[PDB]
Every structure is written in structure tokens, then in C-alpha cells.
Write a protein that binds this DNA or RNA. Structure first.
Lengths: 147, 210
RNA sequence: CGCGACCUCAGAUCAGACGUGGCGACCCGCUGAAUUUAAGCAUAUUAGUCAGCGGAGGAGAAGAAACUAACCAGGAUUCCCUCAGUAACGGCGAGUGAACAGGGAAGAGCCCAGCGCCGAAUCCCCGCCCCGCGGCGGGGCGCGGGACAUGUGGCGUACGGAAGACCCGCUCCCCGGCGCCGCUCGUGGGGGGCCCAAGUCCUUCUGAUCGAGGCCCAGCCCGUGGACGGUGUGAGGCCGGUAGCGGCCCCCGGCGCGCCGGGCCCGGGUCUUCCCGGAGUCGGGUUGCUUGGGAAUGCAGCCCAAAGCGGGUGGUAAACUCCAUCUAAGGCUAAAUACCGGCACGAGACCGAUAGUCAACAAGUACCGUAAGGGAAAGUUGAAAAGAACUUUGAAGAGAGAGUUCAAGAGGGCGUGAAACCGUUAAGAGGUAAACGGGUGGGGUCCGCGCAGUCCGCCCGGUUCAACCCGGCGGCGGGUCCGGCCGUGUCGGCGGGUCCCCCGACCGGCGACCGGCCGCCGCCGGGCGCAUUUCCACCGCGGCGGUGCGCCGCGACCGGCUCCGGGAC
RNA sequence: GACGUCGGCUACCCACCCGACCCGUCUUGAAACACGGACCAAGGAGUCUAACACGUGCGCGAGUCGGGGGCUCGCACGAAAGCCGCCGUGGCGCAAUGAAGGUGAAGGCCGGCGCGCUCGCCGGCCGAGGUGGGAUCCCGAGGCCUCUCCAGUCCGCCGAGGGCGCACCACCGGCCCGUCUCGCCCGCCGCGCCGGGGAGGUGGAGCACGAGCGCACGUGUUAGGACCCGAAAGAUGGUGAACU
RNA sequence: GGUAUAGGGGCGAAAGACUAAUCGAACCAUCUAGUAGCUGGUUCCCUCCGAAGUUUCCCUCAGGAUAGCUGGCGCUCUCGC
RNA sequence: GGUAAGAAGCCCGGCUCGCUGGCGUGAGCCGGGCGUGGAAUGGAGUGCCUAGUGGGCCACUUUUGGUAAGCAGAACUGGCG
RNA sequence: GGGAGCCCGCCCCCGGAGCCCCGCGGACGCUACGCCGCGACGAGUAGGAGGGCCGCUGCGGUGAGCCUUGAAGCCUAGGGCGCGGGCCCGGGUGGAGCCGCCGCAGGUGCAGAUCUUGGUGGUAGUAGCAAAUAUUCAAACGAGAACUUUGAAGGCCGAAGU
RNA sequence: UUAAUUAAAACAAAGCAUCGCGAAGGCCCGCGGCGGGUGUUGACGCGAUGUGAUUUCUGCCCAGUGCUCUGAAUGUCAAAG
RNA sequence: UAGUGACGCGCAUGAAUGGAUGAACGAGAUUCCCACUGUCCCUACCUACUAUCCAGCGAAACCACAGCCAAGGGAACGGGCUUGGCGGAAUCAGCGGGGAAAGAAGACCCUGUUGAGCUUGACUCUAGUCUGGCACGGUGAAGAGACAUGUUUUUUCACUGAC
RNA sequence: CGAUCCUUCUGACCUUUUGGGUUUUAAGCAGGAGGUGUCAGAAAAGUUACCACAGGGAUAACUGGCUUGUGGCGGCCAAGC
RNA sequence: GUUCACCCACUAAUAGGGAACGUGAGCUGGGUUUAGACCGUCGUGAGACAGGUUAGUUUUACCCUACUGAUGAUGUGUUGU
């Protein structure tokens, strides 16, 4: 809204809020990212370190599908299954230990972040972390690998 | 000119983009036109499904998905042959047929054959002429339903099989997922090197004899 | 020395057809820069862009893999989202920059050469007869010609095909004409033509109502019609129209039924025998352009130049070795796609005549330049011309009367008619250019008073009813929760994870409602006739409050100051 | 004081006293012998798109979303509005660190088995650590009293002192990934140029019981014509020997 | 009078002279609203706060970046309670 | 021109140390006891968005070049800007 | 509640104690984005922020809004308000539309840019109507004669000519 | 001869002296062609220069930069082979 | 300080970047003499056409407002300010002291990371030109080197069927 | 005494070289060197009197301003003419 | 061309200066100082020369003030002396 914009309060002011000693010239400093090495080096080195120079190996035909691998932590693992599944756990005097399919929920790798409740569970996933496997074993479950 | 920690960006507005700006003020009119054309086609094919020909069960490449099931381009020739349907007759009956599809696994072939069997089971074939010849369905199942089928015919739904709670044994408890993964990766990396070393050892062994 | 075939090659105003040019908004094939950025500038960027050339349609191009991927695989082309400002390119600087997969719109597949089988079984032209002929076809009759064996037609093309054996089930698809029944979705397809509701009702203004008031219920009638425009203002009903699965008369299109002439003896699966591939092309070197494509993505002049369990691809050059995926050097194809040009329409939070297209008007017009080209200014009398008859001065332009109009104080470039500037009338003033700020005074313009303006507003003194009862009505508040509903939390019947009923109890009894009871208030109707009651006016300036029509004066108290006269330490 | 007398601060003209140089701009410096400027009327210059950053308002909330498409209408109002197993294909965030192969965020206490060996293996328990400063909340001895002396439950205010300690800051520790050093043990389908674990430093845009997504608005920075006007130049295609 | 030479070209007894009142590179249209660190201008009121010509770097010296000066938005606390 | 004028300070008791040492150090951990730490005035601390400026000049005092300069160039403070 | 004090009993309620506080109900003050009370301060270019019941245009709601018994616009020696941007009345012309409030949007406010278009001033009744020898008299038409025509006189171009 | 500030000592001129060329040539135009101008031409010709009537002369220098001559007696020498 | 004739010590003359000379000629540049005259001493007078006035017709540049001076300060030469001198309507013909008079966003100088014409021993290149290699590009005859124990390089001489 | 990019050397039984495997090659990580003396790091010869544009009195050639070295002029002391 | 400078003659003397280094809408343009040319030095070159020579457009007042002149102007009741 031009009504709420600043230009309405600048009516009558000669310089229109852009100084009068140095006028608002068209492009005093250079267009765009001009002078990354010259006359803007201080800014480019104190606000964008690592802008200039190459590093690493080139990969011509890169595909994100090959490296696609979503991760889920043990911090939020029972959220993938219904709450009644966990209700029917630590009960029945049988040791049901239900199966939670991570791939069905939409993750491939299971990570060890977070605390796991004391309830056995069968975790099926493509990849497992060492700490996540240790947590599952300590809780009393089993890690299952799937393709 | 940069000013006190702004993001470094490169807008792609150096060409004459204003001459090639494509507006979308015709979007609702285009939607209305497409809807009218779809309704006209549906009225053209009075008993035929609005969506069109049947589509096969197809899985996805690009292991990113690797699990989703979608509609295919058409039913494979081997699937038609197993189902006992001629490829040219399938086009006239309303079965999508493409001659490029392969068949590596038996599960997809059997699923598509079952889908074709179900489609032929619930297919009502009107006779060419009012007097019904052979292979034409009875007039009883023609007056009851002579309308179209809204949406895709026999829609594909990605269904998962539930697994009941198990009795996990000491072997499954002792399975070492991370160690197995690391060992498998190492074996994949070093399979060729091990084979080369074995070949060199065999060469040395046969050289010792001579 | 000639004639008769064939191959190459000319002439025709030979017979019958075809292309040329224009438009060019969208598209296809070439050629193609520099301003600009990089704070300079040469690679880069602008940019396969402007300019230039050629070629079509209503769309064009592309298009059914010599594909993508490495997965449990997908499966023509085109468009949208996303991938993604990512991989990648770049004096790795400025900057440039895809594709796969996924979700949708649409979805349709096919045909040759070759290989081979059939008596060239093929096609074109001329003559006659029949149908029909305003997008020249079908059949029959022609020892009538031509093209074709240097290859036409049927089967057949990578998804295998062909030929036999003999298992199975049986006999409709299209073309050219002659007619006929249903007016076929914006709810009657397209085009044209003609029509379909209700006040000019009674008063009142106006120059003229379409204004204002009223008319068996906001008012009179219609309303599936209350959009719009015109009519002397602002009109649902004055008119054209508007709404309508409203009506009538014609033409065209397609979808359907009958008849004639025809073409058409057209399949699926098993088994056996054969066959199956586009060359100066791929590919390699090269150089130039281009691309994100980077030891070379694509397009190319030049040179070399193939093979068939072969060839291409697998995003880092090479060798060896297995894999995965297609079949190039031949061709056709609508759909979703784009459309600042052309025809006909609808719409606007857009501009309203120095604005909006250059152009609202005799606008690419007048005009300018030899030419390529450049390119304006310019709307409004009035409802109706009713456009000033006639007399008079002047040669006339111009006036003075008279007249029309509500208005010419609207008189043919005429609605409203501002400022700069000028002429005239009235007032004031005027030797330090004019002009300005602060403070007064003088003169005018009108404004508000008054023929005193002593502004009132409450309390007090000097014709009926409140007070008090009766009947009716209405309202407020309240508790014994009084009785019933209502309603929140818990307990109960398990009575029908989240959602519903019953009685019993407690609690919050919550403005979520009622029936009786009480108290209070208000209204109406009856009594209550006059020490009460309320009006109107006056003599009191008696008490209170803000005030005075103008000019003022005085007194007492306080606050802030400048002083003076005394006494005492 | 009341039929030619009153009030009119402001605005019309005139007179007097004091003050008083023409506006805008460049500039340390303008009234300048610095530049633009006769006067008046109309027009006239920080806009829009996209990408960000911050702040604010709203909705939902470890979720958030409508991009595109589809279903309802013949579009008056509508190219609006409602809805979607499309509700999420997909974007952002919930996980980061390495060039990459890859890896990938929790520990502590107690009992036992190996020599407790600051190391490994078995069970139970507590379950995002600690110090200092921390708005607020809890306990709170006791005091203040009340028309008289005592007893005395209640409504209070202050309340020394003692604690749990939000958000946030400083530090100490802990955890994840890359890298360096010293070292001892674990596992097997394939016992190997296999894989895993410890301690001590260090680098990271990290974890340490979360805060993001969509819309709107404001400011600032850019690419675009880019607040308005302004060049000397360059390129492409056409027209001129009627003057010379 | 006719004709031929057309713009990085023509023509020139040579003056950078002429090439339609322009010639040390003619005219028209387009790219083009070419770029400018350089001039000029930049439209209503009131209130509050209110500066610098300094640091270092840049083929930097009529300019930018960076700190400094400044404004706004707040937030965490103490209290004449 | 730097400091110190107390609670982030002193006095004890006990633990840890793979550092250092004959015993000892030194540092870090926990528990307890002690409060106005010279004068005067102020309410303090903290995090982001951030325009303009980066041509200055003058004056007391000190001072560089120059004979001097309303000259050029510096230091503190104050002004115009 | 008990015991009592410088013979016992009351020591009461505002639908009324009457008030300088009444805890029983509470404005004239309550558009709580409102009202009220104390202190301190007020300069300002470049620049920032806030409030505008300042102004222009169009849109969604709203004033049973205004209006031919007179809209916008324009002029004014009238009455006024607001510090101010500006606004409300009175009079004259005008003849057909216009405005107030709550929100939205913008091609939204001019004194300059040797600003663009158009008009008008001082200069100013001023410079000027001076290159090539020269006109005069009478009459006619005509309202009007120095410029026309006719007649006469005097001249020039002086056959590479006017 | 500089139209429109320079009419000249400038330009040009006959005279003088050099250079290339015998036509698949010398000079030159042309994106392009078995193209075109000299050339309807042939060394007394064409094309490129220097000085500039007549008379008298035209001194020395090849070190430098140019131009030109031959040369497997040859150091460097790209592509291709 | 000019003109002419000799001297060479020539900053820095000089031989076809031509030296010296030279009859005639030159709207070429200079010195002196004769005659001539208002160039002058030293100005004066006459004529025509304007300028002057009138009748008619009638613009333009320029214009912050406007126009009397001395001194002071100022941004360093004021019409405005300060202190003084002073000032009196409306105009006519001249006039060139002033308005730092009018004109053109100074031709000179500098800056610009703005250009253009020209030059080259500036940086990148390009037409053209010379040379080498491959293809168009064949037939015949001899000979030689090298490798090796048939291959290549091929040198020369002939033909035309390509050109 | 020297940033980016590029090249070169050294080191790991170091990673990738893309469908898998082996070997050359190449791309990576870390540590040195090759250099930017305009030294926070463009790749860079002149002339214009034929000149052009945007600006500067920030900056020159006039006058006028402060000063009088210099130029001119005038005094004070007195060894001497 | 000169400011400057020297000489001749006369004379009382031929003293020194300012007024935007007085005075170009007053004049001349002689030489500085555009464009054409010549000579010498420098530079390979285009070109440079406080090194010389020649030819090379001097626009406008009618505005305000100042000045020279001319009508005039307020008062003296009007005019004249």
C-alpha cells in the first residue's frame, strides 16, 4: 500500500530521503556482485568467507534419487505406528514386541538420537546405526534389515 | 553493493524477460475449456468409462521411491498372452497395450494377469448389432447399467501387508545389523582385489611346479 | 542408305493441372551483432537475442526409442508443478545453467524399401451407356493408347513374418446414391427473421419530470422480468429490450431406419521348415560455431572410412572382461500447446480530451523532406433552431430597439468561463524601487446587536388529581430450588478410541427456560371535591448556578517583584 | 449610554516606530560580480515484478502449505467462492559433518563376571548434567493489633531467614562428523591389505526434550528502464551524384 | 541534359576539400528508455530524536566497502510501594 | 596514562589430579562462619533492522615547511558547518 | 469463650447513619485506543520514526445521506475554526450530479529541473516599412482616391533592355 | 585549391630519375563465380613513387631499419608422413 | 631592432628529404625614390539616402525584483546590508562608463577508469599473400637410396583421358 | 616479502574415475615452489593545432584578494671619501 | 607589434604612476592564440617546439542607470515683469 509506504512522508523534502551532499546516483558501487576481489573484498571476506575458490571432486551426472535416504531417530519411533499398538505393549503377559516398518512410514535409515522406552519392538529398515542398534538391543528388540 | 551481511544472490534477470513474461490470466478459462472438453468426450463415449482404457500395475525405478505403485503405460504382450487376450482385440475392448514393456519378475506379471482377469470378469460387452451374436453379454446385464464409471477404472491403491507381533528368538536378538552392513560394504569394495590376489596366488602355485 | 526399336536430349499459343505474390500475433529452417555488465577491458555477458532471408497452418514443430535408468525397473510426442537456481559451465569473476524420477492435462497407434510368394494380378489418359454432377465419383462396354519387369499391386516390418499340418468357434465391414422418422443440452445443435408482464393512476413543484406525497399489505400492478439504453431531470411498469425446458417461419450440420448399386469368402491357439534390415552412412582425426555437457553435448567443410551373435548408449581419455538397454543412416499421425495479426463478441477497483492508441472530430488526414521516412492541432449553444421576423444609423463590418427561449448573463469555434494581462467605475495613498514581519491608529465593506439586552434555569413567600384504597395489565428482584424443563463436573446401568439415553446423589444453580409465592415499580379504569395536587400571570432581585449589550471605576485576600520609613542587637 | 451610537481579535486600503538583502542548489563559505528563474494554467519525477534479510500482525503447529489438477455453473453478482483416499506427490523445517568412499547426536548410579585395569561383558534403577547471577512461586520463626486479664481457632499486612528455581548470560563438563597421536581388545558365511570399540588435542554453519510453515504489512540491499531528464560513441537494415 | 561511381564507401590539379544549408566518416528507422563514479530537479502539515567529512582496503583520490557517528524496534532486570 | 578502594572478598574442614614434587606444591571440586568497604552524582544491561557522512573550516595553547601569507600540513578542546 | 473493671438489661437495621468516609448499591468522570493528577524538557541541515477528525482519485459496506424549492465547479471588501496541512457557513454565476464514517487500492499533493504544452505582459506604438535618379496636373468610376483607369507633361530600361 | 574567415610560398604542371611486369604477368576491385578494371592494351605500354622550367652540378657513407639476390655448404622450423 | 652588399664562428644551411642561379610572369611577402593627394598637421563646407516629426502598419533579443553614489565587512570589486552623502511626477534626441550587459551547459587547463580521427617498435586478432600436407590426380618407360634378405621413399623422361 | 585460478613436487597399502571388476590416465585431501614491486595481487604504446561529450573555479592561463622574498623608495649608528 | 629600449631636433622640462596591469556593443588587428602552408631541430611514424615566416569574418543597445543636451514638474490664487 502506497498509503502506508514511506514515499508519502517524503513529499516536500528536496533530497527525498537520499542525502544532498552525495546524490542517489544510478550505480556508484557497481552492478550486482561487482568487485568481489576489489573495493568489496572487506565485505566479501567478513560476511561470506569461502566464496572464492574451488574445492572437492566434480560429479557430472549427479542424481538425488541414488543418494536419497531419509533418516528417523529413535527419539520419534513409536509415532510411526498407532498409539493403540504401543497400548497393546508391555501387556498381555506374552512379550508381543510389535513390528514397526520404517520403510512403510517413509524412512530408510534409523538413527540413534533420543531415548527409547522400555518396550521390545521389531525395527525393519534398510540401514541401521551402531548406537541405534545398541539402544534397540538394550531395550530388548531386534534390528531387521530389508532391501 | 553489499551492505552489512546480506545473502549473496544472482538474479537471472539480465535478458529481455519482460518480452517473454507468461501471464496466467487465462487459467480459469483454460480449466473451464478442459472441463467442457472432458464432458463432451464422456458424452461421446456413452457407455465407455470416462477415464479411458485400463492401466496396468507398475512399480517405480529410481530407488528413491522403490515402493510406490502407479498406473502403467499399457499391458505387456506376455501378460496378454498369459491372460489369453489378443493384443489387437485388447485395443478394441479397451485395454491399454504397449509393446515396449519387459517382464523380469513373475510377481508383476501375475498381478497384471489377475488384473486383466478381473477386468474381463466385470466387463460388459455390448453386441455389434441389436440382435446379440456369440460372445455378447445377455440383455439382462445391459439395461441395469449402461452408464460410465467415474474416475479411473479399477483404481490402483498402494496397500501394505500388516505383520503380527512375533516371538523374537535369541538368533534374531543376536543378529548384528551394523556389523553385517559394514562387512557387506567391505566385501563389495574388495571383491575384485580378492579375486586378483587369488589369481596371482594360483599363478605362483602353478609356476612353482614348473 | 535407308527403314524400324531403345537410351539420352530439344521445340511447341500441343491436351489437361500446378508454383509465383500478400498478411505474418503464434511456428519452422538459416544468418546474425553492438550498446550493457564485468565498476576498465580482450574470454565471457547482453545472446541463437535485435536486425536480414526463406517456408505453411489454424495451429506449427515434435512424435511412437539406435530412450531413461542400474531400480523388485519405467516405456511415443506435447504442456503445468517439482526436481532447481541443483548437477554442471565460467579471466571458476561477473554471471550462465539443464536433465532423470514423481504428480497431473491428453493419450492412438502405424506404414514402406529390403527378404520372399502370386500369369503386372498395378496405375494413368481418351470414346460410348446409366446414376449423379456448385469440394467430377461409381459401374458396365472398348484387340483404344500410355506408364510399369531399371518393379506397380495384395500378404507382410521387428511387438517377429511367411508357407504347411490340423485343434477350436463360426459367417459382417466399408463405399457411392435414393428416401424416411426424432429439431439433436445450457438445458431447442448452429445461422437468420418476427413477437410475448406490469400506472403515463390522483395531487403538487418544474421550461420539461423520469422529482415529492398518496393509492384493499413499502405504498397501485408485474416480478423465472428490480440488467441496460433512449425518451425535454433521478423511470421495474412510455418504448426497445431483460427472464423464461417462451412461441412461430426458413436454411445448414451430425447422430439414427428402409431401398438400390456394389466391393468383401475377410479368424484365434499348438507343432514343423525357411527369412529377417536403410553406406560416403556410422565411426575416427580435424577445425569452426553452439551447449551445463566438462580429454570435445549437438550441428558441420575437409581427410580416412566400415562390420554383422554386428552397431549405438551406459555424463573422465585408453586397454582387457562380463553385463543392462535399443535397432540409426526411410516415412505418416489429431489430443492436452502458443496466438500484441484477421472476423464477431463479453468484461473492467483502468484514462476521461495536455489523460487514454499518433488518431473520440473529413488521422496515418493536413503538412514537411528528392527519399527511405517524420507527423500534428482539432469534442460540448440549445429539451426543441424556436439560429434573432421587423423598424432605424452606417457602404459594410458593426450597432440601437423588437422577438424566441426558464436561460443569448447559452447568438453558429456559442455549457461551466479561473489565473497571468488589459480597459473602465468606487475608495485610499504616493520625493529613499517595490514588497514583507511585529505593534497600534485612521477610513470603508458589511456582520451581531437595540428603539434597555439588564440572559435566564431551579426552590420558597405572597383545571384536576397525586396522598390512600379496589379491579385489571405489564415489568424487576428473591429464596424454601417450591414443581417441571434446562444445563456443567463426577459417581451408576455397559444400558447404544471417539460420539448417545435413565433414574438416584453431590457440587458450579451458571442471565439456559417456565408454573405458582412474596416484595417493589409503572400504566389504565373507579372511587378520593379540595388546608392536598398541577398549570398561566404578577409583586418579592428572598436562597443557588452560570452571566453582565458596550465603556468603566472601587474594595478586601493571595502569589511574584522593584522600593521606602522606622526601631532594636 | 443608547436611533447615527456600540463590538468585529481575524480580513480591504492608508500612516507611523522597530526589524527586515531573492528564492532553490553545489559548497567550509551565497544577497552575491556563482548557476536556473518575465507571468499564469494543465502535466511532471522513489513505481511494479522477482530474490533475500530483519521487525510486526494472523492461522496452524513438529508439523505447515495450496503450487498444479479434478468435482460443483448456463460467469450477472464469478473469471469469485466451497470441497478433494488429490491433505501431500512436491517445497521448508524435524540432522549434521566430510572432497569423497561414508558416518551420523546420552548418559549417570547401583549389584555381579574378567585383576575394577579410569578397559570389556551381564541385570536393575534415575533418566537431558553441574556452578554462579536469575523475574516470579513455596515454607516462613516472629511482629503489628483488636474498649480490661487470660485462652483462642479465623480474615489479614509486613515478614528476618530458608528453597524449587522460567527465559537469558558467563563458564565447566557430555554427545555427533572430519583430522592427528598413543595404544589394548572384540565379531564372523566367506579369518582378510575385514569390520567395530578407547583415551588424549583440534576443525564444523552441529546435538544437549523442538519452532517451524503459509499469508499480509513496514524498512533496507540488489537484477531488471529501475526516482525523472541528459551524452561524445557502437551495431543492423535501407535512401540519397536535383548542390557538389 | 543524359549517364557511372553510395558511406569505413564514392570522389578529390590534395583544402580532410565535396558527397542535397551536416562531413576527421552523409541521412532515416530499429537495437534504445544504450551507459554515466558527472550536472540539474525531486510535490502536504505537525511532533520527537538527530549526525560526518574520521579508521583500513580498493588502478583508490569528484566513488564504494568496512568500523565510527545516528534512528527505530524491542527485551532482561532495580525501585518513594 | 594504567591499576586497587571487598560478597565475583576473606577464615576454616574434607575430597580429586594420568600435571609437579622426598615429604610438598599448584589447580579444581564440595560444607560451614563472617556484609553498608574513600567523596559526589547517576536507574542500569543487552540483541537486531539501520538512512545520511567518509571535500571541511575557524579559534586559545603546542608545533612542521616557508621571509611572510585570509598559505600548506599536525596535537587537545570549543565553535560554524 | 471464660474472668472482670475506672444492681440488671440493651451497646439495634443505612429502603435510611445522613455524610471529609459508609468495605450494602455506586459518576456529572467510564468514545478504559477513555478520562484524571504530578514533576522535568522543548534549537536544528543531511537522516530516521510517530500522529494526521490534512488533501485527490476509484472500490467493498454504511449515513430510511444531500439534490431542479438547485449538484459539482468558479468568484467574494462577509461570519468563523484548527499552531499547521486544511475545513465549515453567507452572498453571486452555474445547471446535474455530490458528500460524511468504517476498511481497500493508487498513475495521489509542485516554485524551480536553460522542465513539456498553451496563453499573456514590460520592452513598445519602440526598432523598422532608406539597394537599382521621378513624379505632376485634369477628368471618370466610386460612399470613400497618392497608389485604379483615361488624357497631357517630365523621366528611366537605352535593342548582352525594365 | 579549403562552397560559408586562409587564392598562398600551397596543389597541380611539362622537364628529370627510379621500381614491378613478356599475359597461368605487374597493380587493383570483389563474401562468392571459367568473375572484373587497366585491356578495343604489349615495354616508345600499363601500373607505383620521388624532385619539380633553362644553365651548372648531384660529393661521402649499407653501421642501423627497409628492399632485393642464391643457397641442401645449413642452426631453428608447424601440420602431415 | 627595418632594407641592401660582404665575414663565418652555421644552437640547428647544404646538394633530386635536391644546392646555387635565373629572362618572362605573379589580386604572393618586404625596403627605398619620383609624382600624387585631407593618412596627417587641422579640420571645414556641399549633395543624396537614413537618422528627426507626423498619417497608416508594426515586431525581436532580454527580463529573480528592479535600477543615484563614497567607505566598511562579506565569498576577498554591492542596486539592495551597515555608517554617511542624499532623493521630486511623465518624457524626447544622443551617448557608450556601468548592469562583473545579451549568445553557447568555455574553444584554453584538469578530472572522467567517456569517446572519436590518425600513427606504430603497444596488447589481441583478421582479409590478402607465400610455403608444406590430404583429395580431385591417371598411363608408360627407365634409374637410385634406405629397410630387409618384398616394402617405402621415390628422381628423371614421355602420353592425354581429367583440368 | 605475496591472495584466487593454473602448473609442478612430495605423502598416504588415502577417496572417486560413475552397471560391476583389473590396469594406465585423470579428478580429489594435506604440505612446499613458480607471482602479481601499481607489492589486499587489470594482461596494455603514442599523437590530435581536425577534435567531441559529462563536469570542475575541488584545478591552471586574466584581473582583484593576504604577504613582500625579489623590484622601487626612505630612515637609524658611524670606519671612511 | 611591442611595454620596454636607443638615437635625431626643439624646449622651462621633455618627472614617475593609478583608475578590472583605465579604455575592443570605442577603434585597428601588428602578434601572441583555431583551421592552410614554408624552413631548422626532435620523433620510425602520426606529430611537438616562450624556434622563425606568410594569409587568416572583431556580432547586438530600441532596455535601466550615469553623462550631454530639450520639454517639462509641486507650491507662489492665474499670468506677465
Amino acid at each position: 500500500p502506497s498509503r502506508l509506504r514511506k514515499t508519502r512522508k517524503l513529499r516536500g523534502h528536496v533530497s527525498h530521503g537520499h542525502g544532498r551532499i552525495g546524490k542517489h546516483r544510478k550505480h556508484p558501487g557497481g552492478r550486482g556482485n561487482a568487485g568481489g576481489m576489489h573495493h568489496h573484498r572487506i565485505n566479501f571476506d567478513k560476511y561470506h568467507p569461502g566464496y572464492f575458490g574451488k574445492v572437492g571432486m566434480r560429479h557430472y551426472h549427479l542424481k538425488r534419487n541414488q543418494s536419497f535416504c531419509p533418516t528417523v531417530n529413535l527419539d520419534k519411533l513409536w509415532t510411526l505406528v498407532s498409539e493403540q499398538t504401543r497400548v497393546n505393549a508391555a501387556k498381555n503377559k506374552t512379550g508381543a514386541a510389535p513390528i514397526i516398518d520404517v520403510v512403510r512410514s517413509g524412512y530408510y535409515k534409523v538413527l540413534g538420537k533420543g531415548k527409547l522406552p522400555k518396550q521390545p519392538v521389531i525395527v525393519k529398515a534398510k540401514f541401521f546405526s551402531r548406537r541405534a542398534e545398541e539402544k534397540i538391543k538394550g531395550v530388548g528388540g531386534a534390528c531387521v534389515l530389508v532391501a | 553493493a553489499p551492505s552489512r551481511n546480506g545473502m549473496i544472490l544472482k538474479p537471472h534477470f539480465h535478458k529481455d524477460w519482460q518480452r517473454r513474461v507468461a501471464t496466467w490470466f487465462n487459467q480459469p478459462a483454460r480449466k473451464i475449456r478442459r472441463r467442457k472438453a472432458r464432458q463432451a468426450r464422456a458424452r461421446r463415449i456413452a457407455p465407455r468409462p470416462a477415464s479411458g482404457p485400463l492401466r496396468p500395475i507398475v512399480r517405480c525405478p529410481t530407488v528413491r521411491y522403490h515402493t510406490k505403485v502407479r498406473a502403467g503405460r499399457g499391458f505387456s504382450l506376455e501378460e496378454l498372452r498369459v491372460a489369453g487376450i489378443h493384443k489387437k482385440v485388447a485395443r478394441t475392448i479397451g485395454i491399454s497395450v504397449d509393446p515396449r514393456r519387459r517382464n523380469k519378475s513373475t510377481e508383476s506379471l501375475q498381478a497384471n494377469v489377475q488384473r486383466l482377469k478381473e477386468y474381463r470378469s466385470k466387463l460388459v460387452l455390448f453386441p455389434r448389432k441389436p440382435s446379440a451374436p456369440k460372445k455378447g453379454d445377455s440383455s439382462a446385464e445391459e439395461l441395469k447399467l449402461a452408464t460410465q464409471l467415474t474416475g479411473p477404472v479399477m483404481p490402483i491403491r498402494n496397500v501394505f501387508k500388516k505383520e503380527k507381533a512375533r516371538v523374537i528368538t535369541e538368533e534374531e536378538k543376536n543378529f548384528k545389523a551394523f556389523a553385517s552392513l559394514r562387512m557387506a560394504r567391505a566385501n563389495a569394495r574388495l571383491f575384485g582385489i580378492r579375486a586378483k590376489r587369488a589369481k596371482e596366488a594360483a599363478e605362483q602355485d602353478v609356476e612353482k611346479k614348473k
